[PDB]
Amino acid sequence: KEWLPVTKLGRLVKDMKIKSLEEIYLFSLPIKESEIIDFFLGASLKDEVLKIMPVQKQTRAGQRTRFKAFVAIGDYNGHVGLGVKCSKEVATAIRGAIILAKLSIVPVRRGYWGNKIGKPHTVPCKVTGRCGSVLVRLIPAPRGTGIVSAPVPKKLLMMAGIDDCYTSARGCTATLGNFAKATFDAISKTYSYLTPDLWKETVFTKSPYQEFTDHLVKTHT
Amino acid sequence: MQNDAGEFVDLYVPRKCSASNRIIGAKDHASIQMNVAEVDKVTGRFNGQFKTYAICGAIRRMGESDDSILRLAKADGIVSKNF
Amino acid sequence: GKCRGLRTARKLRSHRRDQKWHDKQYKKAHLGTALKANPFGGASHAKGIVLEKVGVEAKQPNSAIRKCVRV
Amino acid sequence: MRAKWRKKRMRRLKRKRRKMRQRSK
Amino acid sequence: TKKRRNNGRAKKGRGHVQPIRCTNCARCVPKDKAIKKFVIRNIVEAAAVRDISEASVFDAYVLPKLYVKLHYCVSCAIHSKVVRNRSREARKDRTPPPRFR
Amino acid sequence: VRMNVLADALKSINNAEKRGKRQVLIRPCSKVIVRFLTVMMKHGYIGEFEIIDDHRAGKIVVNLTGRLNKCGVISPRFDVQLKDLEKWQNNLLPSRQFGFIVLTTSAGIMDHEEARRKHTGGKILGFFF
Amino acid sequence: GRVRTKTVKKAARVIIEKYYTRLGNDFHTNKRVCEEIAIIPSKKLRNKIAGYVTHLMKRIQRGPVRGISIKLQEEERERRDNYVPEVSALDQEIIEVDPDTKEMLKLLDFGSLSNLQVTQPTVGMNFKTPRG
Amino acid sequence: SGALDVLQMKEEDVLKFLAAGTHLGGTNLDFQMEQYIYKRKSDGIYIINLKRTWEKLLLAARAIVAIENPADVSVISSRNTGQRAVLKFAAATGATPIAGRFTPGTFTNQIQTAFREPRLLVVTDPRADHQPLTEASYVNLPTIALCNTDSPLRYVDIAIPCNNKGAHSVGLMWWMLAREVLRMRGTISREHPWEVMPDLYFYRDPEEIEKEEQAAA
RNA sequence: GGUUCGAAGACGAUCAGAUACCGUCGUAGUUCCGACCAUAAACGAUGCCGACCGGCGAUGCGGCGGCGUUAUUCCCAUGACCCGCCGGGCAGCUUCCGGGAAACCAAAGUCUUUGGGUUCCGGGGGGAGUAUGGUUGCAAAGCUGAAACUUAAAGGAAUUGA
Ligand SMILES: [Zn+2]
């Protein structure tokens, strides 16, 4: 039950030197630990099982009906994730889906709709993510509208926090394996977009490994 | 990214490279903040301060990273202009 | 269409009009021979006279013999 | 049965139809 | 789908080549479609050269060679068992097998 | 055939922005293209440019900056009224916070926001954001 | 087909790496050492393990073994991996000067001081070997 | 690579480096290596600009000093030519070298016990160590590669044009890099050159070792 | 004019059952002149024009420059080399340019960030390119072209059991 810090950033988490989880996103460091997110955000981190997909690979000894669990993760106002893990038994499938969902978490981009007051609620600009035959055109919406879409991406946007968005589907959206990757890429490419507001250069700082590189090599092996 | 009051409503700001004048994505694992240690002109030893740079994944997958760092150091004033 | 013309209104209008004939769903409802073969001819309900009853077999595995009425 | 044989059988059948029309006219 | 990158022949932008009749069968094969072979061989097999070198009138008589340009089609080449189906990564290699002996 | 030269120029600078070039060289010296460059100079999306003028269509060297996503061409050029301008900017511009629709008038070439105050329409030129 | 098995190979390297000191080239020496340190159920397995240990000792006496991590060879590698030299190469007063770098070093802070000497340009004809 | 007025060079080591063979390039040419060409030489020889290699070496040494901890420096070697050279370089620096046998699972996977994280990596050859070029994209690790005119430039961070065929040309560049890193860190004073014959630091063929042992004994 | 080859057809076996595989023959065709029609996998299963977007070795044309060469050796420059540069034409290798369901393409990229100009054509599958309408032709056949009726399917890519 007690977590052991495998990575070098895990020792910094165990020593409480890095205070912000967005400093990991700033340096774009690869997260390969599952318990750090549960340590900081324990009660807010919620799980929702979307769909179990059985697939049958055919061998000479009949077939092996293995399951593919889709588990969405995250608080309703904050970070969300999408974990995909296929296994032959349901306990290992759900456990691997929860672990890969804790590893893969993304922030969503809230924006304003014309007038600037209060907290942002809608999608700031027209972005999309396409793969397979799924194209969800993210169009902004006024306040108090809702998500005019299918109920599963409506639930994903309720988990995201963007309460106001108009969608526009295109093609065969019944393929869930391409649909989940499309709705993951569409919310992943929100921050990766050149905007006229982002003209001032981002100030830099020392790497967190370089800042405490004298202490981490001496506090353990 | 202001609000009705005036405070920046965003909680983190992404990076932008100065060589290709392009922003850096969130999950860009090839992005490196390359540091250069400052060297005294009369002693030739370590001083204590550093000079930072930015490397994004697009320049690395295109194949111009060693030229982009060379041009950034040339613009900052380390590498000579002619080369 | 494919041509991004300026004075090309009536050409693409005639193309859309011929596409309206080439469409299958719009053409079938507006046939004269199909409306002649239709026993209603625009009617919703219709009366009739029963004269005999004929049994009809069903299809593959889910089988039955159901008695229809010749009207 | 191929498409070429179907075309040949329909060619013979249309020849028979032309013969019947020539005997009718 | 299209299996090969080309159409199984060396026809690039011409359209028609000279038809060459096959050696084993009488199949009318195109030139670039045909599998061509060029085999050189002495007329002696195991001991005919030794028998001629023992019993002859002339001294150190040179032997002729065989020069026959063979042609095979897709069926006849596999019936003579020359070409062989390879892996899909090895199909793209237009190189001949290595000439070592 | 090269009928709309401005469309090929916008496509060339669009591929230049997709690759990440620092400067671009174009062949004609069209006054509409020069005025469009001076319109973009006031917004500050690109850097300052120069021309090499021969006794033909002189060449233009534009030092581009990474402050532009896509500048598509409008072909053919339709008229824009005051009442229909909302329907133009609804499907043409992505967002309400950022977006510019350049259009020429009888007075001069100006953006969409100044034409709303002056209350005078004109034919559309393009869009850039 | 007297091939030493994986149950012998997983055991013998760990035994030598732990008790590298108490070993010997003789068979009867380490045959009784393996009886002390290890619990082997059968005489045939004991003799196979002891023969493979003597074969690994012959490999050690011949040269270095890639698989096992000997502490003595690790110390010998650590000596030549942490042997810091006294004075290394570069900063003599007289090293090479290149004429095309002479032009580009003139701009920034590598100016033409008194301690410079341009050399003659190197001879060369053509930079392509014939393709055959 | 800039803001120094201390190190200065005059004439003499042309006669040493022509016998060493660091000016020698490859046969073919990569299009990204066109700016590093100084001149040509007969029968398929490029002349690598050694004093531009000096500037790239100074930039790489600034990167080595900016990686302040000397323990977490990965010196990756592939062939038998650059084994004793990177061993003596690890002796001069105080880091952990990798002389061949890269194991997929030490840095990428989290099962094996050897789970380290050195920041700075030094690549001997890209076509040989194409597999350590993969983890530079997954993990944020700077890369100092040694490249030829025949070697391409893909998934690299900084490159140094050197000859990676001759043992003299490899051991010479390591033996010159080891002085620059130690003088830019600073332990030992800037006073004396080296007296001992340089045969110790180059990689030696076993037939040459047996021949020298027979000539000595 | 008809040498050779060789539809129809004969003979010999073949086959439980061969005017099928195969051989010996063999008519029309096979070759041209003066004509008729428009059919091929006329396939690259890929509409035309103009531009931007990596590199490499080489072939075929024209032009241009130069260490060392052969021929006329003996001045003179072109044939034959080698080293280069450009344009048009045909390919190949590598590739996180770019995209797709993949094969893969410097084009099949320059599409959701959707508008460069630009003619023709398809709307679940069959009937069916069938009737019927005329047009061209000595004949064969080509053109535009339905409907009643049936059909929850008919398909493309790419993997297993044998
Ligand atoms: Zn054949």
Side-chain angles (χ1 to χ4, degrees), chain F residues 62-124:
Chain F
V62 177
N63 296 114
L64 294 174
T65 61
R67 292 179 181 177
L68 183 63
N69 289 318
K70 185 176 180 180
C71 183
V73 68
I74 301 298
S75 179
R77 297 180 186 272
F78 294 101
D79 53 355
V80 173
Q81 291 84 17
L82 272 298
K83 293 184 263 74
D84 293 331
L85 182 60
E86 182 68 27
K87 293 188 287 185
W88 286 106
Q89 68 183 358
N90 206 166
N91 57 5
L92 187 61
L93 295 176
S95 178
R96 293 179 66 189
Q97 294 292 322
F98 63 96
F100 292 99
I101 298 170
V102 62
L103 58 91
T104 180
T105 59
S106 66
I109 296 170
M110 61 182 176
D111 55 355
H112 64 88
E113 187 177 1
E114 188 177 2
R116 182 66 62 85
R117 293 184 180 93
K118 289 184 178 180
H119 191 75
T120 298
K123 290 183 180 179
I124 194 167

Side-chain angles (χ1 to χ4, degrees), chain B residues 28-46 50 55 60-67 69-70 73 77-80 83, chain H residues 1-6 32 35-36 52 56 59 62-63 65-66 68 136-143 153-159 183-186 190:
Chain B
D28 193 0
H29 295 285
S31 297
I32 297 168
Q33 294 184 0
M34 183 177 176
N35 290 318
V36 173
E38 292 292 327
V39 179
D40 195 1
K41 64 181 181 180
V42 67
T43 301
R45 291 179 181 177
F46 182 73
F50 294 99
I55 299 169
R60 292 183 66 187
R61 67 176 61 92
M62 183 176 71
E64 293 291 329
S65 66
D66 55 355
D67 187 74
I69 298 300
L70 201 284
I78 302 299
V79 178
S80 177
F83 181 75
Chain H
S1 178
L4 273 74
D5 193 74
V6 175
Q32 292 291 322
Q35 65 182 357
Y36 295 100
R52 293 181 182 177
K56 302 299 288 185
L59 191 146
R62 289 181 185 271
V65 173
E68 185 179 1
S137 179
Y138 292 103
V139 183
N140 297 114
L141 299 175
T143 300
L153 292 175
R154 184 64 60 86
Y155 291 103
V156 296
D157 290 329
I158 197 68
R183 291 294 182 269
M184 288 180 69
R185 289 177 181 176
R190 190 180 293 275

Side-chain angles (χ1 to χ4, degrees), chain E residues 22-27 29 71-77:
Chain E
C22 182
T23 61
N24 194 0
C25 294
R27 180 68 179 87
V29 185
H71 297 283
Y72 293 99
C73 69
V74 178
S75 66
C76 290

Side-chain angles (χ1 to χ4, degrees), chain A residues 18-27 31 36-37 40-41 79 105 107, chain B residues 11-12:
Chain A
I18 179 166
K19 64 182 180 180
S20 179
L21 58 91
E22 294 293 326
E23 292 180 353
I24 299 169
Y25 294 100
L26 183 62
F27 290 97
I31 297 169
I36 297 172
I37 294 96
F40 289 102
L41 294 174
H79 296 88
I105 53 170
Chain B
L11 58 92
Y12 72 100

Side-chain angles (χ1 to χ4, degrees), chain A residues 152-196:
Chain A
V152 179
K154 184 176 180 180
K155 188 180 289 292
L156 267 71
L157 289 176
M158 287 294 175
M159 292 177 70
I162 300 169
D163 190 74
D164 296 329
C165 183
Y166 290 109
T167 61
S168 179
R170 179 66 179 87
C172 182
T173 61
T175 62
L176 186 63
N178 295 114
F179 181 75
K181 291 183 180 181
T183 191
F184 182 75
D185 184 73
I187 64 170
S188 296
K189 288 176 70 175
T190 59
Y191 289 99
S192 179
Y193 182 76
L194 194 277
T195 61

Side-chain angles (χ1 to χ4, degrees), chain E residues 1-3 5 7 11-13 15 88 92:
Chain E
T1 187
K2 188 176 180 180
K3 184 177 180 180
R5 183 175 178 178
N7 289 319
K11 182 175 72 68
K12 304 300 288 183
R88 292 183 291 113
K92 293 181 181 179

